[PDB]
């Protein structure tokens with residue numbers, strides 16, 4: 001079972017800030033034919049998770065252009081150019097590269 | 113608009129059983145695979161079950177094969193989850209989510225339903 005470690009678990013930010021949250025896979029995601037099936041979900045408090053970025057860098061419907069994804073193999077990143085209030089929630093990376101689909105620990109984007 | 117709505121949560125008895133319902137709308141229910149994901153109070157997520165278009169379970173965690181059942185009534189446009197021998201590890205928030213092929217994972221999630229195991 002692949003472990004997705006997300007750092008930092010807590011990232012207190014000021015608004016308008018440029019953030020980068022990390023997600024590390026315990027096993028390479030390019031070890032099979034399902035090459036970097038790494039996704040990100042936001043979970044604002046009280047609401048259900050939302051797909052942010054799928055397959056490392058592909059922004060999904062409703063996602064602003066200030067969000068971007070990068071990485072390959074085991075080290076993946078998620079940037080938010082200017083951080084707004086609406087971006088504050090819980091971020092989960094996930095992988096469907098290997099069975100079973102696995103979720104990360106989460107990074108909590110909180111105001112300071 | 114793609115909408116998923118889970119129901120049936122609340123207080124469940126330890127060692128008991130439950131049936132979670134998920135009603136879908138705004139998309140062809142039958143052409144899509146569905147799943148159930150749970151969020152424990154720790155905020156940790158786990159895939160409980162996956163089912164194909166056809167209503168056939170394509171996946172169950174090793175730890176749950178046995179007390180978990182996932183089914184769908186296409187006609188009702190409803191997805192179900194049945195758990196037996198509930199334990200305290202079953203205390204979580206349950207969501208139905210749709211498996212989008214392109215994403216090759218969950219694209220749309222319901223609001224959730226809370227199951228609180230008790231004794």
Ligand SMILES: C[C@]12CC[C@@H]3c4ccc(O[C@@H]5O[C@H](C(=O)O)[C@@H](O)[C@H](O)[C@H]5O)cc4CC[C@H]3[C@@H]1C[C@@H](O)[C@@H]2O
Pocket residue numbers: 096098099100101143144145146162165170171210211212213214215216217
């Ligand atoms: C969960 C999982 C990773 C995600 C995989 C997935 C993701 C999306 C998906 O989309 C479906 O793809 C179908 C297709 O490929 O034809 C389309 O018909 C459907 O409309 C569409 O919902 C289908 C599947 C099939 C198996 C799923 C795996 C089972 C587990 O072992 C593993 O951990």
